[PDB]
Amino acid sequence: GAYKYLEELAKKKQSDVNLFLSRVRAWEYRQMNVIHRASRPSRPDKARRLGYKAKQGYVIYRIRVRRGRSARCTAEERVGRYCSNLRVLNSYWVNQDATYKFFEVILVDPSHKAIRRDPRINWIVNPVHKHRESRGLTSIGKKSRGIGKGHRFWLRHNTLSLRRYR
Amino acid sequence: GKAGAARIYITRNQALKKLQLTLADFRRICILKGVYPREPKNKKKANKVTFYYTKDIQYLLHEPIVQKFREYKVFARKLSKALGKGELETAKRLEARKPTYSLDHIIKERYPTFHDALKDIDDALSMLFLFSTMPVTDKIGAATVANCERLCAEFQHYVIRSNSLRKAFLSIKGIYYQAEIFGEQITWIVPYKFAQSVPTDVDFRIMHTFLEFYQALMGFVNFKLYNTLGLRYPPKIDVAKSESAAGLAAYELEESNTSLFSNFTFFLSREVPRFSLEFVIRAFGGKVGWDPILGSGSPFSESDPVITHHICDRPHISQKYEGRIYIQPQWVYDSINKGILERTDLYACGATLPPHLSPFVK
Amino acid sequence: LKVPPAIAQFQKTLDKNTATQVFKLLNKYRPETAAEKKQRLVAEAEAVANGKVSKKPYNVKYGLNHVVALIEAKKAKLVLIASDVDPIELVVFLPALCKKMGVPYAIVKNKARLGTVIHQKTAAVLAVTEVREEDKNELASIVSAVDANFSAKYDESRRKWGGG
Amino acid sequence: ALKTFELRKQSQENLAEQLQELRQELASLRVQKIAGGSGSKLSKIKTTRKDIARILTVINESNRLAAREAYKNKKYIPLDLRQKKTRAIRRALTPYEQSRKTLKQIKKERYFPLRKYALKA
RNA sequence: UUGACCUCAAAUCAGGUAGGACUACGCGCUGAACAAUAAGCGCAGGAAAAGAAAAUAACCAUGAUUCCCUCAGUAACGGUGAAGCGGGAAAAGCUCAAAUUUGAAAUCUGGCAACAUUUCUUUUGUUGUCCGAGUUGUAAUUUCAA
RNA sequence: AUUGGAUAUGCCAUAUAAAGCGCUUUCGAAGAGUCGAGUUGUUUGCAGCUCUAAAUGGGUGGUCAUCUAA
RNA sequence: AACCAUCUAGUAGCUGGUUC
RNA sequence: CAGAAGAAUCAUCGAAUCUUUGAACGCACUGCGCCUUUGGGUUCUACCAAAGGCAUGCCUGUUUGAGUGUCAUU
């Protein structure tokens, strides 16, 4: 397959090929809008493993945020507000420079029939997933609030529990 | 400025903008349907150029002709796309399923009654007759020419069977035939069979659209006339007879002074326009015979002595027979127009042709 | 600007004559259309519905994952890479993978032209794996032409940073 | 007071012809009552307002029923001839697409469904 | 040139969808004073969140999450203050990315036409056909327990 | 009256199919501006900034055990 | 500068009161 | 009080109706409009009245046209 080569090339982010493409595309993305639609993901390997399928109902959006809260968390929220009818699936890092960090956000149309008839993404149609990025339910949102398993990661200790027979 | 005479008339660009149709499409819609320019009384006030009533533009907004034209154009682009991509099967299959159109709604709207269509069929009959002899060209359609010729033949057969023809005049341009159908008077001009050439000066697209509308009106009129008279619409046509230039003999009128020359067996040689002579004789109830060179399927032959009058424009008759004295087409045309048989001796071969009086001239 | 050698190599494409001859062979091995496939299958359906064994099909191979797997298996005789893939890193390794596997490869123009062979809008790479015995000499002549007009040519140019 | 039973077996044009005759009659009684109206006038108004309402109902009932029949077996119909329920119910997954499963899951429930069993004590 | 592809736009074009309100409980962000404190802002549901171990342990080992009891006012820290084990309530497991279907994109939306179906003339589908999506990858298959 | 899961039974069933178990002279892909390092702030976690990986590797524990993140 | 709502039952060694 | 004699200032409730605003949506916020259709009328080309519509962001598709595009193009 070609996603093995694409994903091992994405680890050498400052190599000659990757550095030239980082600087060429960073200039191109700056001429576009702050949030602009992407015809296809700039990282087809990374979007594919984050839940993206090349089918109707899946949308890729690019957004630049200023460097200097989590940068990826704000990209998910800003795009979610821009496309209020879509559900933010996931997001990832595509490019950066001295000023901006560029992210691509995967959104899913909960009203398209190709989404509502697909059991593997049928879950995002339910109302409990309205604005997942707004409640810290995405991948970076969950990581932001320290959700995980282990010792590395209140109300039930500030209350007096008085039983009936005590 | 925004009201009154200015709103009364709509400019050609304004009417096209309201209908969202191109100039060629608007012209085709105007020709197919009923729309004519209407010059307002106050041209300066009407402009706040060609002027049209807003009622016609309002009606044409919902006309399906524009939608059908877009579908044909859209399908044509898709057919071109398939040819360029190299998939010939897709283009060939899409050719069969290409869009079409129907003029039944337009004909009913333009002519609510058959009387109005019959009264307005004089131009349609003339256009069909003119296009029945024109050579096939790229601009014209071979199938359309065949359909126009078949429609003209069916109309001639129906007129001959019903004896609706009243006057026949021989003009320089062609043969002018006047007939009365359902009270209405229809005049048609049949051009002579000559080696003409395309003037290359008139618009072929407009003429083709007018011919297509005329053919549709003629076909609807023929079907109504056949149903009223009991004839089968369309009449049966013999392929072998058509390939033999039998003329109206191929079109069988199968059932589903009208006797001026009834007691006469006219015969025509290969020197006169027997296409119009046979129709006139058939419309008069008589029997018309033609030479084998002119066509096949002739009921009579040259050697047959049963022919009372032999039509021949040639000045010499080496094989002249007895009882078949030569006559000229002018006498037949004069007899048909006047309703009384003319003098065969006066219009005999080698004699001065009497002047032809126009029946339409009063 | 200055471009790396792995991206600079895509500006040196196959010449017009060799590319035109390449697509003459490719157009003999187009995959059957969705309509032609349905016609063939329904024809066999009637032979089953009423009452009643073939040869292996022949077509050009397409798809990026499919073609890369064929090169790694050394099943591809000729690999034709589009010159204008929108993310260039999709095919930026293909010339190197084809060099490592000994696969005759060429960079042709207009990824749209590649897609037209396979009845698609767009193809990133086409690969001819194995053709009929009639076209063995035609493919062999093309592979020799690609060797001279693409591999023998350039080559020293593909190791240099382009642009600037 | 006219009954709805015999107000539903006539055509709309004559049914609408009963609208205005009741309309001026109601309007006339208001003219009488402002110049002196008895208790019957108050009731005659009260009877005729409900009487106007009764015939207005059968005009609107039949007009909608005509629209429902016309838009039968059509994919898209006007918003008026549609379910209301609640906004969230109209957005929920239909029972058909809630029951969709992958072919992997179909093979699970076909060969290994939850069996019905019991334990002997 | 025709013509494909990529763009960039347009349409009172077709079908959709978001806003506002409530906010006891819930999940984020932010924040003083006398502490995830009130407030402030953002977002849900009938529950939410969490969730099938990059988890504990040092045993004869345990086995997603959540809640209760206990551990325990203990370790640790500098008065704050857990957790493992243990006892209960409830229990259910799974889905992708990374493999060539390559002897056949096997996948999907929509238009149209019929046929059904209904909490329902209001709902939800089926079959056929055409168009589009899709090879820059849609199905089947696989998820480490393999 | 509207419904749910079963039972019984008629019809239909695209099974040339699809599974579990068993056996191997054949194979077995595992998520990166992340992990991690330095440093600066918020309340160890989190966040910014600079740098930036590996492949029996990596994480967390007591050579060993356990787990398999992004 | 003013006004309003909440934190608040904020802070009291001190003042007054504290029931047959 | 009054009022009707399937009555009721009744209950149930699956059908209809539901004025102006308000997330409030043609522009405005009183008014001023746009397009289309329909009709008036004794004032019929037009005018007038009414009705139907006319917010924004975004998703899927449809149609149309541009390009400084890639080619194709003997």
Rounded to 10 degrees, the C-alpha dihedral B171/B300/B245/B216 comes to: 60
DSSP single-letter state for residue C31: P
What are the residues whose beta carbons fall under 8 Å from the beta carbon of A4, sequence distance 6 or more? none
How many residue contacts between A and D have a Cβ separation below 8 Å?
A: 20
Helix (H) / strand (E) element for D104: namely helix D103-111
Query: Is the C-beta of residue A164 closer than 7 Å to nucleic acid chain F?
Result: no
Distances (CA, A) of B28 to B31, B63, B83, B269, C83: 5, 12, 28, 44, 47
Distance, CA of B43 to CA of C116 (rounded, Å): 57
Distances (CA, A) of D38 to B141, D27, D47, D49, D50: 86, 16, 14, 17, 19
What are the residues whose beta carbons fall under 8 Å from the beta carbon of A166, sequence distance 6 or more? none
On chain B, the residues whose CB falls within 8 A of the CB of C115 are: none
Q: Is the Cβ of B92 closer than 8 Å to some Cβ of chain C?
A: no
Helix (H) / strand (E) element for A36: namely strand A35-38
Asked if B352 and B271 touch (Cβ cutoff 8 Å), the reply is: no
Residue B172, both tokens: 């320089």
- Give me the DSSP letters along B141-166: -HHHHHHHHHHHHHHHHHHHHHT-EE
C-alpha angle D117-D120-D121 in degrees, rounded to nearest 5: 140
**CB-CB: which of A120, A122, A127 is closest to D97?**
A122
Asked if B69 and B33 touch (Cβ cutoff 8 Å), the reply is: no
Å between CA of C13 and C1' of E66: 62
Asked if B208 and B144 touch (Cβ cutoff 8 Å), the reply is: yes
DSSP single-letter state for residue A127: G
Flag whether B touches D (3+ CB pairs, 8 A cutoff): no
- 């200055």: which residue's tokens? C2
**CB-CB: which of D93, D101, D102 is closest to A125?**
D93
Helix (H) / strand (E) element for A65: namely strand A58-66
Q: Tell me, what amino acid is at B44?
A: K
Distance, CA of B58 to CA of B235 (rounded, Å): 40
What are the residues whose beta carbons fall under 8 Å from the beta carbon of B3, sequence distance 6 or more? none
For residue C88, give the chain A residue with the closest CA: A21
On chain B, the residues whose CB falls within 8 A of the CB of C30 are: 86
What are the residues whose beta carbons fall under 8 Å from the beta carbon of C149, sequence distance 6 or more? C14, C15, C17, C18
Distance, CA of B145 to CA of B128 (rounded, Å): 9
Residue B13, both tokens: 């660009």
Say if the Cβ atoms of C7 and A20 lie within 8 Å: yes
CA–CA min distance C96, chain A (Å): 11
Expressed in angstroms, the distance from the first to the final Cα of chain A is 67
Helix (H) / strand (E) element for C98: namely helix C94-100
Å between CA of B349 and C1' of H5: 109
Residue A63, both tokens: 């957004």
Query: Is the C-beta of residue A67 closer than 7 Å to nucleic acid chain F?
Result: yes
Q: Tell me, what amino acid is at C148?
A: A
Q: Is the Cβ of B173 closer than 8 Å to some Cβ of chain C?
A: no
Sign of the C-alpha dihedral, residues B214, B219, B222, B227? Answer: negative
E strand residue ranges, chain C: 2-3, 61-62, 78-82, 105-108, 125-128, 162-163
Say if the Cβ atoms of A120 and D102 lie within 8 Å: yes
- 């040519």: which residue's tokens? C153
Query: Is the C-beta of residue A64 closer than 7 Å to nucleic acid chain F?
Result: no
Residue D100, both tokens: 């969709």
On chain C, the residues whose CB falls within 8 A of the CB of A40 are: 86-87
Distance, CA of A116 to CA of B75 (rounded, Å): 33
Flag whether B touches C (3+ CB pairs, 8 A cutoff): yes
Contact partners of B by the rule of 3+ C-beta pairs under 8 A? C
Asked if B244 and B297 touch (Cβ cutoff 8 Å), the reply is: yes
Neighbours of C152 (CB within 10 A): 9
Residue B101 — φ and ψ, nearest 5°?
-150, 160
On chain C, the residues whose CB falls within 8 A of the CB of A29 are: none
Residue B272, both tokens: 């006169």
Query: Is the C-beta of residue A150 closer than 7 Å to nucleic acid chain F?
Result: yes
C-alpha angle C82-C85-C90 in degrees, rounded to nearest 5: 100
- 């057919």: which residue's tokens? B79
Q: Which fold has domain A2-157?
A: Ribosomal protein L15e (3.40.1120)
What are the residues whose beta carbons fall under 8 Å from the beta carbon of B18, sequence distance 6 or more? B10, B57, B61
On chain A, the residues whose CB falls within 8 A of the CB of D91 are: 127
Asked if B261 and B160 touch (Cβ cutoff 8 Å), the reply is: no
Residue B181, exposed/middle/buried by CB under 10 A (0-12, 13-18, 19+)?
buried
Q: Which residue is nearest to nucleotide F6 (CA to C1')?
A: D116
Residue A66 — φ and ψ, nearest 5°?
-80, 140
Domain range list for chain A: 2-157
Distance, CA of C159 to CA of A16 (rounded, Å): 13
Distance of CA B37 to the CA centre of its chain: 26
Flag whether C touches A (3+ CB pairs, 8 A cutoff): yes
Neighbours of D81 (CB within 10 A): 13
- The count of C-alpha atoms lying within 13 angstroms of the C-alpha of D55, restricted to the half-sphere facing its C-beta, is 23
Residue D7, both tokens: 């107000």
Contact partners of A by the rule of 3+ C-beta pairs under 8 A? C, D
- Give me the DSSP letters along D69-102: HHTTT-SS--GGGS--S-HHHHHSPPHHHHS---
Distance, CA of C142 to CA of D41 (rounded, Å): 105
Residue B261, exposed/middle/buried by CB under 10 A (0-12, 13-18, 19+)?
buried
B308: left (phi over 0), alpha (psi -120 to 50) or beta: alpha
Distance, CA of B60 to CA of B58 (rounded, Å): 5
A49-87: b (≥16 Cβ within 10 Å) or e: ebebbeeebbbbbbbbbeeeeebbbbbbbbbbebbeebb
Q: Is the peptide bond before B234 cis (omega within 30 degrees of 0)?
A: yes
Asked if A48 and A89 touch (Cβ cutoff 8 Å), the reply is: no
The angstrom resolution of this structure is: 3.0
For residue C31, give the chain B residue with the closest CA: B87
Distance, CA of B120 to CA of B217 (rounded, Å): 9
Residue B27, both tokens: 């012209």
CA–CA min distance A128, chain D (Å): 11
Residue B157 — φ and ψ, nearest 5°?
-65, -40
**CB-CB: which of C4, C64, C86 is closest to A20?**
C4
Closest CA to B221 of B301, B123, B325, B136: B123
Distance, CA of B327 to CA of A10 (rounded, Å): 103
- The count of C-alpha atoms lying within 13 angstroms of the C-alpha of D81, restricted to the half-sphere facing its C-beta, is 18
Q: Is the Cβ of C119 closer than 8 Å to some Cβ of chain B?
A: yes
- Report the SS3 class of residue B296: coil
CA–CA min distance D115, chain A (Å): 25
What are the residues whose beta carbons fall under 8 Å from the beta carbon of B298, sequence distance 6 or more? B289, B290, B291, B292
Domain range list for chain D: 1-75, 76-121
Å between CA of A154 and C1' of E77: 18
